[PDB]
Amino acid sequence: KYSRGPFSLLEEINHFLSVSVYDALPLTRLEGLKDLRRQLELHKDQMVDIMRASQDNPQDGIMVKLVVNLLQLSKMAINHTGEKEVLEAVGSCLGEVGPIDFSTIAIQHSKDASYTKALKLFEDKELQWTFIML
Amino acid sequence: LLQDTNESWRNLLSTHVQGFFTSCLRHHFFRCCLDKKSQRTMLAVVDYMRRQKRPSSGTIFNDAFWLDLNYLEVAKVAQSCAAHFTALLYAEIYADKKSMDDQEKISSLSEKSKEETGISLQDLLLEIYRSIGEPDSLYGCGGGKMLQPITRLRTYEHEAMWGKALVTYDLETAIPSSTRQAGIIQALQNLGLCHILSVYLKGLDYCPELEELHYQAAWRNMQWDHCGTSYHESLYNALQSLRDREFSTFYESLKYARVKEVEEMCKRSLESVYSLYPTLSRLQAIGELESIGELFSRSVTHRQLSEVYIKWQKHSQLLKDSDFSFQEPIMALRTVILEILMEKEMDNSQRECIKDILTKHLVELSILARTFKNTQLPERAIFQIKQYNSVSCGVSEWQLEEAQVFWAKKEQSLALSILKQMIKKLDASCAANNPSLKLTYTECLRVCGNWLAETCLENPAVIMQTYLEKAVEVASDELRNGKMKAFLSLARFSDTQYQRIENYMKSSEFENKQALLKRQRELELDELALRALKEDRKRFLCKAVENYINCLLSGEEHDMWVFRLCSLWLENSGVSEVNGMMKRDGMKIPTYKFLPLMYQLAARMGTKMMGGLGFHEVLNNLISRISMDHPHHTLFIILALANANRDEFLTKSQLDEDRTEAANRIICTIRSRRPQMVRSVEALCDAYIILANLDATQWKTQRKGINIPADQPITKLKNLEDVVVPTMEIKVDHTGEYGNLVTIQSFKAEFRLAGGVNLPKIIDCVGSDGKERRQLVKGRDDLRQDAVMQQVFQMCNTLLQRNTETRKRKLTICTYKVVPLSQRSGVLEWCTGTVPIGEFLVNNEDGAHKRYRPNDFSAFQCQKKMMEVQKKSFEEKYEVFMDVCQNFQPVFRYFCMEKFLDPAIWFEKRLAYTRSVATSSIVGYILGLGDRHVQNILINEQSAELVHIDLGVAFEQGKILPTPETVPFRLTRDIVDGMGITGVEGVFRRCCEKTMEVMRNSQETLLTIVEVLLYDPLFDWTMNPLKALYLQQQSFNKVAERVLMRLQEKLKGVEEGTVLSVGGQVNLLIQQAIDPKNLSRLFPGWKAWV
Amino acid sequence: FLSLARFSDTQYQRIENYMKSSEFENKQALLKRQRELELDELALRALKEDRKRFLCKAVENYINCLLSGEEHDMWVFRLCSLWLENSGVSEVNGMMKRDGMKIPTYKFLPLM
Amino acid sequence: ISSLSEKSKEETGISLQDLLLEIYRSIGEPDSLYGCGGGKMLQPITRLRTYEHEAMWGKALVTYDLETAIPSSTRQAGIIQALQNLGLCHILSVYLKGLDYCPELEELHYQAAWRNMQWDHC
Amino acid sequence: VEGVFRRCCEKTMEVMRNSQETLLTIVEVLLYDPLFDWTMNPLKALYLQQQSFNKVAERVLMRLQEKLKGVEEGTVLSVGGQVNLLIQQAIDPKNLSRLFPGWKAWV
């Protein structure tokens, strides 16, 4: 993983989200959650830099995206074998960010980019229904 | 529904769906209390149907009614399902449909909806806006239920009016006991009445929320005796076990609290970001407690405590813009943590370090509470500091903080007495020789001098000689910052005295006194007094300029004071001392700080006063150094100065020729430094000028793009790697490297036309990367006014971003780079994705007023009627305008409805639009902006924000025109309609108030900037008969003085001889802008009906 | 009566200040340097008519206020200032002759 | 005054400023109390008296709650007076009930009882 | 001037502020009196120490309005701040030294 150079806080969070793109079960994310918490608590000047960089487009902010991803992951962990272990790790990582002003009011859930492009490919209403059903 | 005929399916489905939604809204009955899954399924069905184009084409509003639905019930159901944004959208749709239906035949709509459907529109809107969490929107919800005690209490809690909330909670008994007692406890806690709260809780001993507040008070007051687990109960148990050294229970309780808080948060629907903040604050507090757990577990060392305090300070810096309601519990927990650690130390060496850490934390808490206009908490923190940090030396920073706290409470006598006692003790103890106490001594002297100047309790001579000059003389990053602050304070006081002495010399009283003696020892006495006054004025000027120069050297926080420094230098050009100190120490100022004033500094240069201390020589040296350090920011301005009269040369006064000679000299110097870059920039400017002069009337009707003729030199230019794209904004670099910047590569062959009288040309410039930028090349037009107006807009944007309240709301002014090239030639950035509001609204082919409401009057009819009624009296104008407005309804609310189908995105874009309108209106009023017609305002399709263009008319020069402009800004019916159902109420009014407050707090900076701009010789801003005729198809010194006085009155709030608050001034501006009486008298080309 | 008189006086003073303002002089001078002249004449006549109407309403309500009671006898100064400045206005003189002569005489003593 | 006051305190043990403040407080003239100034104004009791003179009952209540070195009877009397003068009748009654767990204390209790029409207490 | 004097000055200035319109009307009536020669002339100036009228009257009226509103040196001031400015200007030894000897500033 650490080939071609080390990772910064922004790169670590991007890697965490990219891994989070596909998640079979919430319990498999415990070690990644612990590593993310350690990285967040180790570097906060880089967190200030990230917040400053995301000022221009607060909607695409990395920190609010990470927070909503963690919240969705905790939602998916309800009523499972590793419910409390995942919840503790999520709370541990959310304690690092704290109540930062994200300059957003609307939570934007992650949406697949390929799905939207595939929908745009079809120009007929009947074809789109076929694609979605298949 | 797609293949439905005779509307049988439509009627059946509409009836059944309406029955289902009505059944969902009951409360058992025969059919009620349906599961939320079915309600969500039906809401998804409705949302899917809303986004589908109907077979009869039409509009999005038409597409919303696939089925005949009562959207108020659907909105209420969506609100019950925690889908707040779609609930608001459906409520807006229902209101619009009800208005449209009524026109065929909020309070009135609310009572009607209550009469038939049993649901009040105003109450539903209030509930939705409360659930969303936006603070400004709550103000404009309605006025029907303002008298109810619950609404008043919620308003008081929102505004942190804790005394009013406490009084109302005590007074009202009809409120349920649980809510009443919870509010009383919260208000008592927020007022710092900890002992009163404890005794009140003891009295109540004669619901889970009561125990929750009990535990919160117990852990906040460190009682340690009051004994599913809740949050504050877990925190109290963890603190008790931490004191008892039971680490296992401590960690177990913290883990349980983490799990419970995260589970409670994730159980919610997670619609708005504002619902996440309290959970984040609680999790941060738990994390900090767990962090100190290990520090308590092992041996305590000074390095570990310093590191944990540094971590706390960094993570608090992360929370700079957070609300006080989220920062305060964390600070309280930190204070309790430090107090417990100090209690359980039993080691004198570490106890002193813990005491220092606690003192620093409490000073920071006092500062934070003062920044939020809170007064009880700073006093409590100072009391705690006194309790722990018992003082006998009598000199400390926390005493200065106590003086600041007392000043914040309007008790100026106590603060001044404390600060003077500190000053005398510092003077007696040592002659400012202790390195630790130098900063405190300087800060105390500076603050006391400023306070005495503010309260007018001491004469200027005593204040200058005893406090400010002494503070400068007393005075390593902290020392540098203190030096900068002291220099700024001394410069400001000297400038104030110099301005007072100059105002007296220029006043009418002085001239009357002089003329009285005009009609023998009296003349000698007058001459002596005049000489003494001139000497004092020169001394104050020299001191102010020197201290401004010193302030600019030692810091960067006060950079905007370069405007005042340059104004002082320019006005007193003939003074040798000012020129001498600008030559000696002024040149040591970093060059990038002069960039905002580059236009004025370049326009002021000449070749008349040449000498060792001559003004022109020093100015030329400064300009040369600035251009050498930042060639990308200044070369275009200097070259445009040199190429003022190159248009006629390319096609086929003493001040002007001196300016041209100076520009040529600077160009020669830069070319001697960088020849290739200068040559390439000159070639690019020549190509741009030649392109502008090209006739375009041949392809006037063409709109598909025109190939640039091969004879144009612009096509030949290729791979200019030493030239950056002129229309692209460049970040200022303190270092002069500028290694990685996008450079011009080529120009696309095709060019388009944007319309208008002069037919400007749009061209595409592909840079070093694949991206290309569209540029608008304008000929036979002056863009320097636009450039300076954009400079003003950038300064105002800096002011708005600096202030916390305007930074949180993202209040900004949209700007575009303008690069003037000659007297009548220039190039400016073309905004991408922006369409004029007039093009969207009153287009003849596919305008919004035609697609929606096709039975109303056309824009042509309205324009014809308003032009016909031009010659008649005011009564006829008013009657015709009212008749037109009756038959021309606003349509602009559909822009965001049709461009953004997602309710959350739609809400965000509408809020951005409202904030942009408020900021632009306030900023334009402050600058006296005019000619704000429909074609001069653009709206970005992606962001739904407004961009103001064509900045030629400003400083209230439109009121001198025939048919004068009688509105501060454009607030017509379409603009207000775009804001939503609430209109100007709510978000718009509060954003206007915030912007006006920021303008008021920075009146001196704005006044200095405008004074520098207006007195620029090349800035043509005064209205002339030729420009007046074109717009609608020395006296300069006194005009500028009158304009500056009017601007100062605007900034101070003086309207027609009466001083007004920010809210009152905003209320006056809004009512003047929306008044149909003023709108009827306006020019028909302004299109007030739109 | 006092409230109505005060509001009318405020409006009249606003129109007088605008007429005496430097912005009005600048607009007139700029126009000097032909439908614009006709529009300016119409606007000036309308402004003068509004000023006269506001002055008449203010004077009438001041006179009515002085008749009703003695709590606001200090406004005779404002009433007489309005009368003296607009001495050529026939309506003000008529109002002073008809209802101004029904005011008690002792209220005019301070500015005798 | 300050130099004279400190010299007099050094020689005869009497502070001129404090004596003047006591005399002016005994006289009763309101505007005269602002003439006396010095380092004694920062004492909590002087600030509380100034607050009560100006009827700034919120500041007086906050200061009475915050300061603990003040004698208990004076603290309780000031707290009760500030609570009553702010209209917080219910809060005052619950505070008095909590205090159950001095002749001035029962005097204030009787005043609150007759003001609040609490006829049950005897 | 730190006791009764300052508070009485504040009360009187507050009364003057609350009745700015009344005082302005009274002074407007007085200043336009044809027989009231309030303006200064060189004869009176020489005797004291051994149209333009409309402009000076308007300037005096606007200065009085500024005083009544509280605007000093272009800055709006509270009653206490204005009284503080007036007292410190009156007791200023520099202004007293610059005054005419017949005024007897030392007395």
Ligand SMILES: Nc1ncnc2c1ncn2[C@@H]1O[C@H](COP(=O)(O)OP(=O)(O)OP(O)(O)=S)[C@@H](O)[C@H]1O
């Ligand atoms: N920065 C810009 N971005 C996008 N469009 C622009 C910009 N500046 C000007 N335009 C458009 O260019 C056209 C003409 O611009 P103007 O500078 O207003 O020309 P003009 O001299 O004002 O003639 P007009 O507009 O017919 S009165 C209009 O359609 C404007 O909307």
Ligand SMILES: [Mg+2]
């Ligand atoms: Mg235009």
Ligand SMILES: [Zn+2]
């Ligand atoms: Zn039911």
